[PDB]
Design a protein around this nucleic acid. Structure first.
Ligand code: MG
Ligand code: MG
Ligand code: MG
Ligand code: MG
Ligand code: MG
Ligand code: MG
Ligand code: MG
Ligand code: MG
Ligand code: MG
Ligand code: MG
Ligand code: MG
Ligand code: MG
Ligand code: MG
Ligand code: MG
Ligand code: MG
Ligand code: MG
Ligand code: MG
Ligand code: MG
Ligand code: MG
Ligand code: ZN
Ligand code: ZN
Lengths: 100, 92, 73, 53, 56
RNA sequence: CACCACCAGGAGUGGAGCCUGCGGCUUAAUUUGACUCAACACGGGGAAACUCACCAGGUCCAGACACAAUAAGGAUUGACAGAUUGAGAGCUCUUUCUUGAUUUUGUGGGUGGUGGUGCAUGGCCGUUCUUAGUUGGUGGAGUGAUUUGUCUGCUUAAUUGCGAUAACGAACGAGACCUUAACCUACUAAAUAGUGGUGCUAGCAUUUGCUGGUUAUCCACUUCUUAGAGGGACUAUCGGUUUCAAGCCGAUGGAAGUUUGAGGCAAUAACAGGUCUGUGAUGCCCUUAGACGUUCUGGGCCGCACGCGCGCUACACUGACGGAGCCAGCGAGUCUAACCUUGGCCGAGAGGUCUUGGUAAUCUUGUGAAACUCCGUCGUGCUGGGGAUAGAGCAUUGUAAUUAUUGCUCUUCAACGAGGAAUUCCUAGUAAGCGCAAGUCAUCAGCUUGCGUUGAUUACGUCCCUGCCCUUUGUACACACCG
C-alpha cells in the first residue's frame, strides 16, 4: 500500500512526540515500518543591519529559522490509514501523506 | 468621484450581499477581485460611504477593511429597494 | 529651497466644459407628414438607430462609437 | 488618458514594495517574504526568526 | 506545490499579518494574542481576548 | 587596566594606476542626511527608466462630506480627422455628435506630501562600556547632608575571589544561561546517506586475484553521513611555589586543559549622539489644483583644475605563460510561475538551440573553486612584469544602453623598480595568502555578510606612549574650566 507520513515543523519537541505517537500507535496495529529518517536540519538565515538609519558602528545581526523534516514510511490497509492521520495533529506541525 | 451609475450599484449591491468588502490600496490596479469594476472605484466609493457613518474602515497592511453599520443596513435598503431584513451580515 | 519664480510661459488654458447648446434633437420637422432624419445613423450590432452622426467636412462620425462611417456618394 | 500609469513596472526597484509599509528601499526578498529591512526587524520574532548566535 | 522553506516562512508572515489586524481593531476588547491551527478540512483561529462577550 | 595602547614581531596603508564615498569647483539640476574616536564601500545608497526626493516641460484629481448655486426645453463626461504637442495627451483649439444627475461653480471642511523642525517627540540604534560597575535589608559612625559595608594586600577575563576587617547577609551587572564547533566502533534508525556481499556484466591477469559498471539482483549492516536522546571536563592526577588560601606554573592522562573555541543576551546613570527620507509612528509650521499631491517624457544624481578616507591590481623567477594532475564548505533555486540548470548539437569565444531533472539529503551538485602540485618556454631586460588609456567588430539583459550596462576577440601596452612625515589591524587553525556562496540583482561587484582551503613569525610582558577607571588632595567650581 506504501503510504508515507512526512513531518516538517520548526518546534522540535512538538514534532518528536507527534512522530513517536505515529510509531507507537503503529505497533499496537503491528505494522512494519521504516523508522523516522531525519533529514539534515536546514537553517534559514537573514543577516541585517541593526540600525534603521545608517549611523553608528556597523553592527550586523543574524536572525535564523531552523526547519526539521522527518518522514515515516508505512504499509497498511485503509482503516488504519484513515485512523492514524485523523488523530495526532499538533499545532505548528505540518503533516502530509503520500501513497506509493 | 465621477463613476457611471451601474458600477456604483455593483459596489453597493456587492456590499449588501457580503456585509464586508476588502480592497488592496493599489490605485491603477484597474481591476478589483470579487467585482468586475476598477479598484479605484471601490476604494473611493467606500471612502464616500465611510464619511457619512455607513461603513467603517481599518487599514491593516494596505487592505482597507469595510464592515457596514446599523446605519448601513437601513440606508442601503432604502437605496436598493429590497425587502426588509434582507442583509446577510445582520442575520446569522 | 531657494525661491519659486514660477518661470514658465503662461499657458493657462483650462478648457470649456462643453458649453450648453440650444434646443437639440432636430431630426427634421414635417408639415402634416412623417419626418425623415437629418444626420444619418449607423448600421451597428448594438446601436438601435438612436445615435446620430456628426456631419463634418468630408466625414461622418458616430459620437458614442467614435468611428467614422462615411462612404462614397 | 491611457498614458497615465503606463511606464512598465515589471522589474527594478519600482516593481516591489514592502508588504507592510509600502516602501521601496531596504527590501528583504529572500525566501519570498518581501518586507523592508526595518519592518522585518520589528516582525522577525513573530514570523519565527530568532537570535541564537 | 511550493517548497518547505517558503511554506513555513509564508505561515510566519500569515500569522504576523493576522496578528496586526487583530491588534489594530480588537484593541478595545483586550486582545492578547492569536493562535492558528492548520487541520484537515479546516483552519482554526483562536482569538484570545478579555471581554470575550464583546467579540461575539 | 587594554594589540580599538605600547613591547617582540607579522601583514599593510600613506607613493602609483584604477574602483568607490566625502569636501570643493561647476551646473538647469549636479536631491539630501551624517564631520574626532562615536561622518566618509554609511543610509543595506552596486541610481540607464522606475526607485527619486533635484532640474525642463506636459496630464490628471485620485478636492471626502455638508450647505448654497447651476440644471432634464440638459448639471456634466468622452472623442474621429486637422492645427498643435516629444507624443496615436483632443491637453487646447476648428468641427459637431455622444452621455445623463454620478458631476460642475463657490463657502466651509478635508485629504495627500521622501516639504520643515531628531533642539517638540515615540520606537529603534550607536556611544560612555562590553570596561566592571551599581544597590537595598539589618547592625555600627555622624545633629545632619551622608558614610561603612563597596578595603591596605594578593588574585582573576571580571567588586572574580581569598584575606584583613564594624560589619554580616544578599540583589542586579560579570559568571551561570542559550546557540554553535569539536568526542562517542555506547542507544534509537535510514536506496532522499553509505559501505560490504550476492546476482548480471566489462577489462586485465590467470591460482585461489585487481579495478570498475548495474537499479528493482536481493540479504544483512551503521564504521564513516544525518539528529533525537544521553554521556563526557570538573583545570582530573602528580610535582613545585604562595596569609601554604584564593590561585599560578610544569608533567602525565585525555577528543578536549588560553573562561575547552566562538558568539547571542547584557546593569545604574546618561548624550540636546543619529534617524520626521523605513513606517497608515508622530505634535506643530508650511503646502494643497498654473500643487511641495500623483503620473508621463527627457535630463541629473556619474559632471573635473584640486584636497581627503575605505579598497582592487601590481611593482616580479618564493614569478608570468602553456599542458597535465586535482581536492572543499556555507548555501540558493519555478505553477499557475518560467528560477537552478544536467545532457546532445552549432559556434574560437561570449552565446544560441532541442530535450530533461528539480517545490529539493532525490536534480543543478563530488557545486571537479582558486591558491596549490608535476613537466615544460622565459632568463634580470619596464621584460613574456603590469594591463591603465584608446580603436574596430560579435553577443547578452532590457521599452531603451550614446557620458562606451555587462560579457568575448584582436590591436594599442601608461604610471609603477617596495613607497617621506605619518598611521592601522592582529596572539593560533589565529595573522596573511586563495577562492566560493548569499545579500542587493531584469543586467551589472573592485562592496558587505558568511564559508571553506593553505597556513607563519613573535610574545605569554608592562605602564613608556595614547586612552579609560580608581585613590589621596586643593577648590571661591556645581547650566560644574567651554566654570
Ligand atoms: Mg553615518
Ligand atoms: Mg594609494
Ligand atoms: Mg551613499
Ligand atoms: Mg550617498
Ligand atoms: Mg516631484
Ligand atoms: Mg501630499
Ligand atoms: Mg512627491
Ligand atoms: Mg529627539
Ligand atoms: Mg544605617
Ligand atoms: Mg543614628
Ligand atoms: Mg546601612
Ligand atoms: Mg614550577
Ligand atoms: Mg601578462
Ligand atoms: Mg561553489
Ligand atoms: Mg592608447
Ligand atoms: Mg608611531
Ligand atoms: Mg584575503
Ligand atoms: Mg591651595
Ligand atoms: Mg557654587
Ligand atoms: Zn454607435
Ligand atoms: Zn516596511
Amino acid at each position: 500500500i506504501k503510504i508515507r507520513i512526512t513531518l516538517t515543523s520548526t518546534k522540535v519537541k512538538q514534532l518528536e512526540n507527534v512522530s513517536s505517537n505515529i510509531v507507537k500507535n503503529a505497533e499496537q496495529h503491528n505494522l512494519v515500518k521504516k523508522g523516522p529518517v531525519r533529514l539534515p536540519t536546514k537553517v534559514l538565515k537573514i543577516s541585517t543591519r541593526k540600525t534603521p538609519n545608517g549611523e553608528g558602528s556597523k553592527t550586523w545581526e543574524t536572525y535564523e529559522m531552523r526547519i526539521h523534516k522527518r518522514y515515516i514510511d508505512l504499509e497498511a490497509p485503509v482503516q488504519i490509514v484513515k485512523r492514524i492521520t485523523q488523530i495526532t495533529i499538533e499545532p505548528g506541525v505540518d503533516v502530509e501523506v503520500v501513497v506509493a | 468621484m465621477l463613476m457611471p451609475k451601474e458600477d456604483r450599484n455593483k459596489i453597493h449591491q456587492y456590499l449588501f450581499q457580503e456585509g464586508v468588502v476588502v480592497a488592496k490600496k493599489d490605485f491603477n490596479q484597474a481591476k478589483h477581485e470579487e467585482i468586475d469594476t476598477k479598484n479605484l472605484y471601490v476604494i473611493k466609493a467606500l471612502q464616500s460611504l465611510t464619511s457619512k457613518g455607513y461603513v467603517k474602515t481599518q487599514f491593516s497592511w494596505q487592505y482597507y477593511y469595510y464592515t457596514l453599520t446599523e446605519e448601513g443596513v437601513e440606508y442601503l435598503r432604502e437605496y436598493l429597494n429590497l425587502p426588509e431584513h434582507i442583509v446577510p451580515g445582520t442575520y446569522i | 529651497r531657494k525661491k519659486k519664480v514660477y518661470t514658465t510661459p503662461k499657458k493657462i488654458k483650462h478648457k470649456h466644459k462643453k458649453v450648453k447648446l440650444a434646443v437639440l434633437s432636430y431630426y427634421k420637422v414635417d408639415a402634416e407628414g412623417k419626418v425623415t432624419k437629418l444626420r444619418r445613423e449607423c448600421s451597428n450590432p448594438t446601436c438601435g438607430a438612436g445615435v446620430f452622426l456628426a456631419n463634418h467636412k468630408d466625414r461622418l462620425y458616430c459620437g458614442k462609437c467614435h468611428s467614422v462611417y462615411k462612404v462614397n456618394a | 488618458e491611457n498614458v497615465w500609469f503606463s511606464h512598465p513596472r515589471r522589474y527594478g526597484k519600482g516593481s516591489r514594495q514592502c508588504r507592510v509599509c509600502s516602501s521601496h528601499t531596504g527590501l528583504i526578498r529572500k525566501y519570498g517574504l518581501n518586507i523592508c529591512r526595518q519592518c522585518f526587524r520589528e516582525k522577525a520574532n513573530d514570523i519565527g526568526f530568532n537570535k541564537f548566535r | 506545490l511550493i517548497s518547505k522553506k517558503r511554506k513555513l516562512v509564508a505561515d510566519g508572515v500569515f500569522y504576523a499579518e493576522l496578528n496586526e489586524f487583530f491588534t489594530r481593531e480588537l484593541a478595545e476588547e483586550g486582545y492578547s494574542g492569536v493562535e492558528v491551527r492548520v487541520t484537515p478540512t479546516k483552519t482554526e483561529v483562536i482569538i484570545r481576548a478579555t471581554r470575550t462577550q464583546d467579540v461575539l
